[PDB]
Design a protein around this nucleic acid. Structure first.
Ligand SMILES: [Mg+2]
Ligand SMILES: [Mg+2]
Ligand SMILES: [Mg+2]
Ligand SMILES: [Mg+2]
Ligand SMILES: [Zn+2]
Lengths: 135, 104, 120, 79, 49, 178
RNA sequence: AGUCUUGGAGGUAGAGCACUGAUUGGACUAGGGGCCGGUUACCGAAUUCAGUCAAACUCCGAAUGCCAAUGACU
RNA sequence: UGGGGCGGUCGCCUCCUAAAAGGUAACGGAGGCGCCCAAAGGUUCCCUCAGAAUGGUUGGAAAUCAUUCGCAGAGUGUAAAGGCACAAGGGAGCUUGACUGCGAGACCUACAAGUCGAGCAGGGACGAAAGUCGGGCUUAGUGAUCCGGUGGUUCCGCAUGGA
RNA sequence: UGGUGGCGAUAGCGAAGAGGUCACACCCGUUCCCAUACCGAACACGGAAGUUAAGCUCUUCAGCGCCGAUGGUAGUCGGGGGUUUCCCCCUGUGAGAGUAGGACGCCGCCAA
RNA sequence: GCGGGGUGGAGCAGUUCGGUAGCUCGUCGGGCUCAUAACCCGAAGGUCGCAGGUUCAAAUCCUGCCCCCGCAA
RNA sequence: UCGGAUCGCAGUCUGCAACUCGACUGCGUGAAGCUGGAAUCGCUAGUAAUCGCGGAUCAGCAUGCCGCGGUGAAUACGUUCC
């Protein structure tokens, strides 16, 4: 599971997810990619599951770029406690994905094979996504 | 060594003129310990020295295998440390092969 | 190799520092001095308008001396500019040492300006 | 658990205290600040704690001070 | 270690000023020329014992 | 001085002809010579500085300035502001006087001397040669000396390139290693 | 007091990478370990090219709101 | 006080939350303070820092030099923020303004407090002079009243003089 | 030309040139004033042997840096709507980035 | 997550307040004995859990990191 | 100027042959060692102690072994104890 090696602050505001992706909206490195249509948090667990799905289907042929990184920490309070008495402890790591962001890129395979690999990955993710080609 | 003799950084940085008369003597002792020597001449070694320092000196000198020459009018200290005597009598120095207590 | 910084560039730094606390006004203008290898110059400039009221150097026809880059010449220059200032109704001035150490020729020019009757 | 945070100092009401174009009596505090966000211009002093105050009566004028810095001036009214 | 002190004027004795000093750095009674309001002039003030 | 007078009359015009400059001002000359005694044993021995300053005094014929560490370094147990070096700046006559003695006497007396290296230029026409023992200098008496300290001698020139500086030092009489 | 006009203080939204942190791929890499001082696609500092990201990052930077000034209309 | 209890907190400083004036809560997110300096203050004068490459006896990645590049990538007693390279950073000479009486007018503010202040007078430090100096780059380093101790005093003193 | 000011680097860096009779410099000395944590390097004090090589001044260059629209877009004020962690429409406003382009200084005073 | 421990081979001090690393037993070598034990005579064995700072000097003070033991878990 | 180890260099002799692995010589080098803890051994007179000499083995090689003489002591009260 991806996570930063250190962070400036362990506990961050959840923030807001308005507007389209600031950058990274086009396929830049690979030939094919999967593009987000909705905003959502993507946990490192979801990235790991998606990457394994797409890479296994490609039989370790061709490169996979992960264009999102789970930098944002999120917390959770202990089970069965009342409100208050301080912010929760850091639980996990998420990447904030806004509409337009290309999450994964694939290269070194046919489009037909690429489409299937990215379809399998998309079903591991909690957002709707479309297949895109580079320009 | 100074620290072991109870002179800490404070006293070390001060002019010797400020040190107590026994503190001045612990400073002179360190100048002796730092010498790589074979003989110890102790001229009145028990003046200006407190019980802990005198007791420690007594223990150490009993173990020392080199030559010790000590002048002291504390006959107890002499009688514990010295086994032979040079007596100054009638403008003559005579050597006696006996302890201070026996000679008297 | 060794690039030598220009003395003038260094001098301008010292002069700028002087000018932080010191500036010529209409009533009490700034007597600025410049000291070259060969000559010495004095201007009396009001800084609110950027106008030089009086001036005198070792290039004027009044001064007759050959070695113009020494204390004797500097004394005459300070005297001459100070006379012209009194004619133009300048009594009080601020001395701007131009980044030079207040010594030798510049000090000599200053002394001449006081005797001629500038209040500083 | 329990929080190790929860402290803060009183707000120091910094910032501009008179407007550009406004008439001020001498002594009036013009700007409170840490360091020199704004510099003292004409007829303005800088107090011990960087406060900018009018040295005379006049109109406050905030002005560009070179390329990246600002200053405030007080200009006496044209009688 | 660092203590409050009072400086008395050495002419009139008045304890005109209070200040602090670090006793290890300045163990001796400090002296300072300071304005004495009674004498209406600057005078040597010495730390009181 | 022999070397100084030699430069003004013979060497300077010769170098003008060599590189065909537009002005005599363009001829490389030697501006200053700094001799540095890295006193790294000043941390351990307190009187290490006094040894280096007494040698430079005789060697340079000019009172050195004691240089100190800019920052603390753990490896050497060095605290900022500790005197750990000596330095002396020679200009003008005293520079030539020392350089004359250095070339004529000191470098020959180096134990198994084989000429100074050709690679020891900074890249912009400044030479630095490392002296290892202070015995080569005839001012230093063997008996009084306790420790065998060396030194660095930086020749700073106005030559833009190393080639032009090398030509300058050669004619001055620098024993280059063939 | 409202509105219009004019001036000004400020660093948010957005945006951006110029600093501080986090971070992807390639290049170049000092070293580091595992092999016989010579190499492994073996951990790899740093540098650079492109590309992301930030409540407690900013080369920038609004809309509003705020403080005034001069008339005008109310 | 997301019942009470435990734990934590209680006064002050800095930042974020705070939504571009100011202000703004939660047992919201981060840290500091209860000092330090007799120079680390004042003034006069001078001055640039970190880092890298190359050259060099010990010398080694890194001690001291020397050249080139090099906006601050350093430093600024002490947190953080805001400032600072006509320096507020570094060095040197002399000094004690780390002054006395004050104070137009402002900020902040329920009050009590807190903050800034030109200028005036007295007597001074530095400076040739202008001029600067009522501590420190700025913002923490603190505690009302009552009651006691001490020093000064053209005050009072229970008939009067003292006490 | 030299000095001395004002103005956001459109004023700067970098590159290629050109100039000095006078002026500015480099440059030549340390008896004196003054000086360097050492050094006449600097700061001082004096001089004029020669050099435009550098500084400086004057040219040309858009290579770096700087300035900078219009349009579009994000955001946003006010007013609505919806499928409401958000999104869309209307009045107004309107960036940042990117770009056309600007720009290798403009305006003073004194002296020679 | 909350506390307590890491000092020669074993068990323990010394830590706050910096100043030669120690006590008991054990291990090793040599004696005594026919031989072993006891006993006698010498020595080794920890740089104080590990890695860096502060200091002239750190087991001791500071910073991180790794183990052991209690609970909750 | 005790002590002679170790080591460098150069040699002699024996032997087919002195590297592993010989004795001796010359030059140079100049170690530990300042009378030795617990403990323990020999000796009653020409003995102990000390000084040399010879011989067997043997081409060469002894600080060992077996012999020889030179100088030449101290002490034995006694049987309490091992
Ligand atoms: Mg006494
Ligand atoms: Mg944003
Ligand atoms: Mg509760
Ligand atoms: Mg605000
Ligand atoms: Zn008085």
């Amino acid at each position: 599971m991806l996570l930063p090696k250190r962070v400036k602050y362990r506990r961050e505001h959840r923030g807001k997810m308005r507007g389209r992706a600031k950058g990274g909206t086009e396929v830049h490195f690979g030939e094919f990619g999967i593009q987000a249509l909705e905003a959502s948090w993507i946990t490192n667990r979801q990235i790991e599951a998606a990457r394994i799905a797409m890479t296994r289907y490609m039989k370790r042929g061709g490169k996979v770029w992960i264009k999102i990184f789970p930098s944002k920490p999120y917390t959770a309070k202990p089970l069965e406690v009342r409100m208050g008495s301080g912010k929760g402890a850091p639980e996990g790591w998420v990447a904030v994905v806004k509409p337009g962001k290309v999450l994964f890129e694939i290269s070194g395979v046919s489009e037909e094979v690429a489409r299937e690999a990215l379809r399998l990955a998309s079903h591991k993710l909690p957002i709707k996504t479309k297949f895109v080609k580079r320009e | 060594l100074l620290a072991n003799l109870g002179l800490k950084e404070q006293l070390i940085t001060k002019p010797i003129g400020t040190l107590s008369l026994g503190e001045r003597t612990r400073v002179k002792l360190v100048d002796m310990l730092m010498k790589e020597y074979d003989v110890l001449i102790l001229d009145q070694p028990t003046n200006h020295l407190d019980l802990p320092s005198r007791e420690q000196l007594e223990q150490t000198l009993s173990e020392f295998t080199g030559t010790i020459i000590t002048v002291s009018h504390d006959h107890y200290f002499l009688n514990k440390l010295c086994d032979r005597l040079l007596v100054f009598e009638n403008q003559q120095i005579k050597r006696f092969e006996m302890k201070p207590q026996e000679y008297l | 190799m060794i690039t030598k910084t220009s003395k003038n560039a260094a001098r301008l730094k010292r002069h700028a520092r002087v000018r932080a606390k010191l500036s010529g006004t209409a009533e009490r203008p700034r007597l600025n001095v410049f000291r070259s290898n060969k000559h010495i110059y004095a201007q009396i400039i009001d800084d609110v308008n950027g106008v030089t009221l009086a001036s005198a150097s070792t290039l004027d026809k009044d001064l007759n001396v050959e070695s113009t880059g020494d204390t004797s010449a500097a004394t005459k220059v300070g005297e001459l500019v100070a006379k012209r200032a009194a004619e133009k109704g300048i009594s009080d001035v601020v001395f701007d040492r131009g980044g030079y150490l207040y010594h030798g020729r510049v000090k000599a020019l200053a002394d001449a300006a006081r005797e001629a009757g500038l209040k500083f | 658990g329990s929080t190790k945070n929860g402290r803060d100092s009183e707000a120091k009401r910094l910032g501009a205290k008179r407007a550009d174009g406004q008439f001020v009596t001498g002594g009036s505090i013009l700007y409170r600040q840490r360091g020199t966000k704004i510099y003292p211009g004409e007829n303005v002093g800088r107090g011990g704690d960087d406060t900018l105050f009018a040295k005379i009566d006049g109109t406050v004028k905030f002005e560009r001070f070179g390329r990246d810095r600002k200053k405030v001036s007080v200009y006496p009214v044209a009688q | 270690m660092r203590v409050n002190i009072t400086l008395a004027c050495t002419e009139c004795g008045e304890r005109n000023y209070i200040s602090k000093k670090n006793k290890r750095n300045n163990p001796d009674r400090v002296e300072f020329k300071k304005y004495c309001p009674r004498d209406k002039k600057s005078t040597l003030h010495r730390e009181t014992k | 001085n022999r070397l100084k007078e030699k430069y003004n009359k013979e060497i300077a015009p010769a170098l003008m002809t060599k590189f065909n400059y537009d002005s005599v001002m363009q001829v490389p000359k030697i501006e200053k010579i700094v001799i540095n005694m890295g006193v790294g044993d000043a941390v351990q021995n307190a009187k290490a500085i006094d040894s280096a300053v007494e040698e430079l005094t005789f060697i340079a014929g000019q009172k050195p300035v004691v240089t100190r560490a800019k920052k603390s370094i753990a490896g050497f147990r060095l605290r900022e502001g500790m005197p750990i070096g000596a330095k002396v700046t020679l200009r003008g006559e005293r520079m030539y006087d020392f350089l004359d003695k250095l070339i004529s006497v000191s470098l020959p007396r180096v134990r198994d001397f084989r000429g100074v290296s050709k690679k020891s230029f900074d890249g912009r026409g400044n030479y630095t040669l490392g002296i290892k023992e202070q015995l080569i200098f005839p001012e230093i008496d063997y008996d009084k000396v306790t420790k065998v300290r060396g030194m660095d001698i930086v020749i700073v020139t106005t030559a833009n390139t190393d080639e032009e500086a090398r030509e300058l030092l050669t004619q001055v009489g620098m024993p280059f290693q063939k």
